[PDB]
Structure formats: structure tokens, C-alpha cells
Amino acid sequence: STFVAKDGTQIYFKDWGSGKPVLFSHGWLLDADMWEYQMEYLSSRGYRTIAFDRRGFGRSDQPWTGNDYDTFADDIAQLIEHLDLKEVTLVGFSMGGGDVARYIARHGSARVAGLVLLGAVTPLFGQKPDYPQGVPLDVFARFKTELLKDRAQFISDFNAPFYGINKGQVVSQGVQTQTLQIALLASLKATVDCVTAFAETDFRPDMAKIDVPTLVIHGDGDQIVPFETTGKVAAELIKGAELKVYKDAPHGFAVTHAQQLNEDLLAFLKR
Secondary structure, three states: OEEEOOOOOEEEEEEEOOOOEEEEEOOOOOOHHHHHHHHHHHHOOOOEEEEEOOOOOOOOOOOOOOOOHHHHHHHHHHHHHHOOOOOEEEEEEOOHHHHHHHHHHHHOOOOEEEEEEEOOOOOOOEOEOOEOOOEOHHHHHHHHHHHHHHHHHHHHHHHHHHHOHHHOOOOOHHHHHHHHHHHHHOOHHHHHHHHHHHHHOOOHHHHHHOOOOEEEEEEOOOOOOOHHHOHHHHHHHOOOOEEEEEOOOOOOHHHHOHHHHHHHHHHHHOO
């Protein structure tokens, strides 16, 4: 399905099943397909599942402008309004934890029942003057330099640390190929601008606006988004939040720990 955002951008989404809605926001490089197994799992158990391709990714249009978290959050607001969703459980992976958090911060929680943050960049990813424990901006400047030379090989090399294959996680060649295929659909411009967005955007003000039941899940083997300065902190900053830590799990744990995640999502929903 599609809708058209404020600035004319057509955004692809899937809307499966019936019942209480669960809206998924994917990570960097990926698209709505990264959620296919969670969507099938929950929609065959009485939930409605909705997942969109972020602007510049997957099957959506690729605008030059608006590749920033305020726009991403308003794109989510527009999808929610397009479908007239109510009592939504928002679920964000990696950089997509930021746009579901920013949506609550900008739009409030009247339509929201709950929030799930998976390996998310919340509450802050890159260093700031009062956050020297964050990831040095040097690191993200280098992502951008490498992407602007050869984004295809960058994505391919990123599979190993993303999935923890260099630390004994087992992921098939097929999954690695699908990840690269999906990533290559995206815009080079959006891909690079997202680096700016997740490197530098501070969601700590957002944490204080989250007034719904919240579950944070994160792998403590995560080589991309360090658990100790993101998920661990987000769980403390959000009032009432629950934390689950998947032992030695990588960033790409919706694949390596799919069954565990499916069961944890269902239990959160049934709380």
C-alpha cells in the first residue's frame, strides 16, 4: 500500500491482519521486510501488523530533503492518521527506535498503547559535550566517507559485525544476500543523511515524554549500537520501562534471536 507524506513523498507500507495494531519502524539500510517474521507471527495470533519503508529506503520514494528525525516522526504521524490507528504499539529497531520515540515527543501518546525499543539508538548514540561515553563522531564521518566511495561493498562488509558472524553467530548466505539486496534499493543520499541523523540527534528530551508501558530489548554483544550507552540508559530514563538483555546477542538479533523476540513481543502485548 502507499500514502503520500506532506512534501509529496510516496511511502510504501504493509498492513496485515486485524485486531490491535502494532506498527514497526525498521533499522538503517533495511526496509519493512526485516519485520516479516514478527508480522506473520503476531498477525496469525490476533494482531494487526503495519510496517512501512522509511523515505529513501526499500520501495518508498527517495526525496533529497527531509531525511531527518523530525520528518521521519511526522511521516509516522501521517501513516497513523492515514489508517486512523488507535491503541498502537510502536516497535522500532536500531535507528528506527529514534523515529517512534520522536513521534511520541512531537505528537504525544493519545493514539499509543505501548513502545518497544530493539537495539535502539536511544537515548543518544554519538558523543556530545556531556556524553563523552557516546560513539566518537569520527566513526560516523568514516561511515560517510566509505559510503560515498562504494556503498555496495560497505553494506556487504557491514553484515559480519551487524549479525555477529565475526563472533560466532550463525547466519545463512541467503540472509546475507537478502540484507544486501534490500539495502541496495535505498537512496545513496538517504543512506548518508541517516548517518548524520542517528549520529547527532539527542533523544534524551524524548525519553521524558514517554508515558506509556515500554519494553527495551538489546544484545550485550552488540557491536554497532553499544548496549551500555543506549538501551541500558534508555531503560532507566523512561519511567516504568522494562529491560530485557539478550546475552551475547548481536545488533541483528531480530534474525539471530527471532523466536525469542517473537515470544517477548507477544508477552508484552498480552501484559
